[PDB]
From a paper:
The TMEM175 channel was found to mediate a major K+ permeability of lysosomes and late endosomes (hence also named KEL), and is not related to canonical K+ channels. The vertebrate TMEM175 proteins are composed of two homologous non-identical repeats, each comprising six transmembrane domains forming dimers; the bacterial homologues consist of only one such repeat and form tetramers.
Finally, MtTMEM175 was crystallized in complex with a Nb that in turn was engineered by fusing an N-terminally truncated Maltose Binding Protein (MBP) to its C-terminus which greatly improved diffraction. We solved the structure at a resolution of 2.4 Å using highly redundant data by molecular replacement based on this novel Nb-MBP chaperone, with structures of Nbs and maltose-bound MBP as search models and could build a map of high quality. The structure of MtTMEM175 revealed two densities attributable to K+ ions, termed 1K+ and 2K+. The K+ ion is complexed by eight water molecules in an anti-prismatic geometry that are coordinated by backbone oxygens of Leu42, Ser43 and Ser44. The second K+ ion (2K+, occupancy ~0.5) is not coordinated by water molecules which suggests the permeation of dehydrated K+ ions in these channels. The K+ ion at position 2K+ is located between the layers of Leu35 and Thr27. In the structure of MtTMEM175 Leu35 is occluding the pore to such an extent that K+ ions could not pass. This bulky residue is thus likely constituting a hydrophobic physical gate. Due to the highly constricted pore, the structure of MtTMEM175 thus very likely represents a closed state and this implies that structural rearrangements have to take place in order for the channel to become conductive.
Numbering used by the authors:
A (entry chain A): 123 to 243
B (entry chain B), D (entry chain B): 9 to 240
C (entry chain A): 244 to 282, 302 to 483
Write the structure that this text describes.
């Protein structure tokens, strides 16, 4: 069983639709879980118990997992490596070892209601 | 782009009344400038450039009317006989006051030019600055300003009278009612100068000073009339 | 905008095979605004006008809720007098309708009686606490009143949270306009005997049995 | 029809600001030609045909402004107070420079007519070619050109300030930013002649030669200002 841990504010249903195409082409089950406090439940469960196979979180929490020895070193071939922006790979690097796969750059913005506020602060 | 977020703009499509109206506003500001003579020599060219301050004041004044027109037809999308009639009265007043404004703007630009000390050219070109002529100056331009705001009040009242046909909601009814009050309050200041000038209490220039001084106290005097109706 | 210009409009419309105004004359709640427009001298003026409409064959003698509603929705009459609840049936029909201020009579406005739709619990019920739960947590809620309102409109709901949606509706504006020109009914026990006295008075004067002066005499007793 | 394939044109529907604006541009080019006197005789008819070269230069100049206006309102579909204000300032500058352009175009057509050897008619009709008058010629038309491009920069900056309200994508943001730079770079050449003429380093015609010579080096001097900002 392939088990993925990703936060509940992300697109786990869409991630499951990718997991459903994977089972069609291989035969492996892809369940997607979203537990509360997974950023601080993963290093406790994954150290002792089994936990997930793959963990999804912003790159900032991964250095602590890498130092503790809770993450496998990523070894992607040049052709896969070349598909992503070289600056994104730098964010997922700890002591000259790739510790994760970069997915997307996130930054907070000001979301505003144009009807209640056309020219916001 | 819009004034109110609660208003549903019925006049987003351009109509003949608005197209005709845009032609008239464009023509008014265009002919105000291009009614001047073509410079034939360097001397005429420098003379013609002294006219830009008077024209800037006239143009600023006309687009402010054009803006109010744009907002009214945007809000209600009206196109009936009475709206056409009131709209024609408006454009008619505008048109008859285009060249008189060119005159007033040139006259006041010389008077304010003398004050600040930029120029020192004669005002004898304008004719005789007598009490009767300076009183008729207030009464004329005062009657012009009063009529424009009076017509905008009548136009908003016509939309208020058709509130149900236009399917106006509680917010839109309130806006329309507020727009009538705004235009009557705007029409009240030139009406008060005009009346003071026509009675002429002092029988001398003092009358014209007071009549002219009500426009400098536009904002405060508008607040007094607005405060009197709210206090009761 | 005035009651007194309806006879002229009706002459104009009857030539084109259409009525001007059809509304429920049987129930006094619909005729009361015209009767109470001026006021007594006001009730005598208002009712005599209503009697003259039936006497001039502008309105039918036994005009009830159903034939008035049906006639307006069919597109036979140009006007009708009704409440929020009636709008949904007009929307169902293909009639571009408008809701507006009631016509004025003798210059002054027609004062309709304002009702507050209200839910009461029967004193002889064992389910008093179950009904309180239904009324509070399920009906008197943004979601509960929306369900009732999409069936047949409630009018200006008592729920504070509905203020903005009510204010966005032009028909509610016209309803509130008439409600301010009218007045809320006292809840007093004598309202039943009062309504019956007005129901008979209006029917007798409409059919042609009792005079307008004799109708207010029997109704004031 | 469109400039960029990545731009989503918000102003495909015609509005009042654009309709009014078209009236003014049409009036400017029309009255420039039709402000002339009607020929009454064969002699006037031949005189009036000498005016087509000056008019072609004026008309070419005005439609180039009209085109920039068309592209701006096509890109953003703007209709707010500040856009109306900047749009009025633009049309105002256009209008005050219509008859002065007719003058400059006739004057330069005689000067270039004398050079090539097509005609040999007098320039004494224009008045006195003195240093002060030839300096005011640069300062006047230089101030006109600077203002038009300055206003186009302010208009694009107003759209940049409303990028989120207009839902501008990364390509459209880039275009808008590039359009501001383009108009400021265009406004920089008349600003540099105007300043050189107003200081007047030589105290003689040499000043006017240099000021006039910056327009012949428009493209190269625009590239220097563009290269200075990219080199840092
Ligand atoms: C504040 C400083 C600015 C003061 C500006 C005062 C301008 O005052 C005004 O100038 C222009 C100068 O062309 C005169 O205008 C004169 O020349 C213009 C030049 O095209 C002719 O169209 C017009 O026939 C003639 O009246 C006005 O008659 C004078 O009243
Ligand atoms: C390059 C070759 C072309 C050189 C063209 C130079 C034209 O120069 C210009 O000619 C026209 C001839 O009508 C003169 O214009 C004159 O006649 C026109 C004829 O309608 C009148 O409107 C105007 O009142 C008068 O000024 C200008 O005052 C002169 O400056
Ligand atoms: O007709 C007199 C009758 O009028 C009022 O009833 C209204 C009711 O309030 C409305 O909701 C509507 O449905 O119509 C009724 C009249 O048809 C009074 O509330 C009632 O006491 C009185 O009998």
């Amino acid at each position: 069983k392939l088990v993925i841990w990703i936060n509940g504010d992300k697109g786990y249903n869409g991630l499951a639709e990718v997991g459903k195409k994977f089972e069609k082409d291989t035969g492996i089950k892809v369940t997607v879980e979203h537990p509360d406090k997974l950023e601080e439940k993963f290093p406790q469960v994954a150290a002792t118990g089994d936990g997930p196979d793959i963990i999804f979180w912003a790159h900032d929490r991964f250095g602590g997992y890498a130092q503790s020895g809770l993450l496998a070193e990523i070894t992607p071939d040049k052709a896969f490596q070349d598909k992503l922006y070289p600056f994104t790979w730098d964010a997922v690097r700890y002591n000259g070892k790739l510790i994760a796969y970069p997915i997307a750059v996130e930054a907070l913005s000001l979301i505003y209601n144009k009807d209640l506020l056309p020219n916001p602060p | 782009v819009g004034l109110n977020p609660n208003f549903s703009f019925r006049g987003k499509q351009q109509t003949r009344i608005e197209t005709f109206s845009d032609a008239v506003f464009a023509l008014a500001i265009t002919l105000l400038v291009l009614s001047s003579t073509i410079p034939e020599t360097f001397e005429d060219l420098w003379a013609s450039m002294r006219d830009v301050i008077p024209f800037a004041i006239c143009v600023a004044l006309i687009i402010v009317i054009w803006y109010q027109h744009y907002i009214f037809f945007l809000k209600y999308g009206l196109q009936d006989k009475v709206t056409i009639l009131l709209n024609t009265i408006l454009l008619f007043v505008l048109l008859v006051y285009v060249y008189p404004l060119k005159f007033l703007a040139r006259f006041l630009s010389e008077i304010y030019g003398g004050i600040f000390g930029i120029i020192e050219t004669d005002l004898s070109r304008f004719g005789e600055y007598s009490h009767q002529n300076l009183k008729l100056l207030m009464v004329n331009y005062g009657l012009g300003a009063f009529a424009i705001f009076l017509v905008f009040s009548l136009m908003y009242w016509r939309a208020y009278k058709m509130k149900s046909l236009l399917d106006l909601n509680s917010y839109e009814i309130f806006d329309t009612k507020s727009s009538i009050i705004a235009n009557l309050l705007m029409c009240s200041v030139p009406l008060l100068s005009l009346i003071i000038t026509l009675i002429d209490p002092w029988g001398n220039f003092r009358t014209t000073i007071l009549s002219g001084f009500l426009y400098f106290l536009y904002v405060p005097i508008m607040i007094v009339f607005g405060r009197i109706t709210s206090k009761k | 905008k005035t009651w007194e210009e309806i006879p002229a409009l009706d002459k104009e419309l009857k030539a084109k095979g259409k009525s001007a105004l059809m509304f429920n004359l049987q129930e006094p709640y619909f005729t009361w605004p015209l009767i109470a427009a001026d006021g007594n001298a006001g009730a005598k003026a208002g009712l005599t006008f209503l009697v003259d409409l039936i006497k001039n064959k502008h309105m039918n003698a036994d005009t009830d809720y159903s034939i008035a509603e049906a006639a307006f929705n069919k597109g036979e009459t140009a006007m009708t007098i009704n409440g929020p609840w009636a709008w949904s049936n007009i929307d169902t029909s293909k009639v571009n309708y408008g809701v507006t201020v009631l016509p004025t009579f003798k210059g002054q406005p027609s004062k309709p009686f304002v009702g507050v739709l209200s839910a009461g619990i029967n004193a002889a019920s064992p389910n008093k606490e179950l009904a309180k739960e239904f009324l509070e947590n399920y009906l008197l809620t943004d979601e509960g009143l929306e369900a009732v309102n999409k069936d047949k409109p409630l009018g200006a709901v008592a729920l504070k949270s509905y203020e903005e949606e009510l204010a966005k509706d032009p028909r509610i504006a016209a309803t509130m306009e008439n409600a301010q020109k009218g007045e809320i009914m006292p809840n007093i026990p004598q309202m039943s005997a009062f309504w019956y006295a007005v129901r008979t008075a209006v029917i007798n004067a409409a059919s042609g049995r009792q005079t307008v002066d004799e109708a207010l005499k029997d109704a004031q007793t």
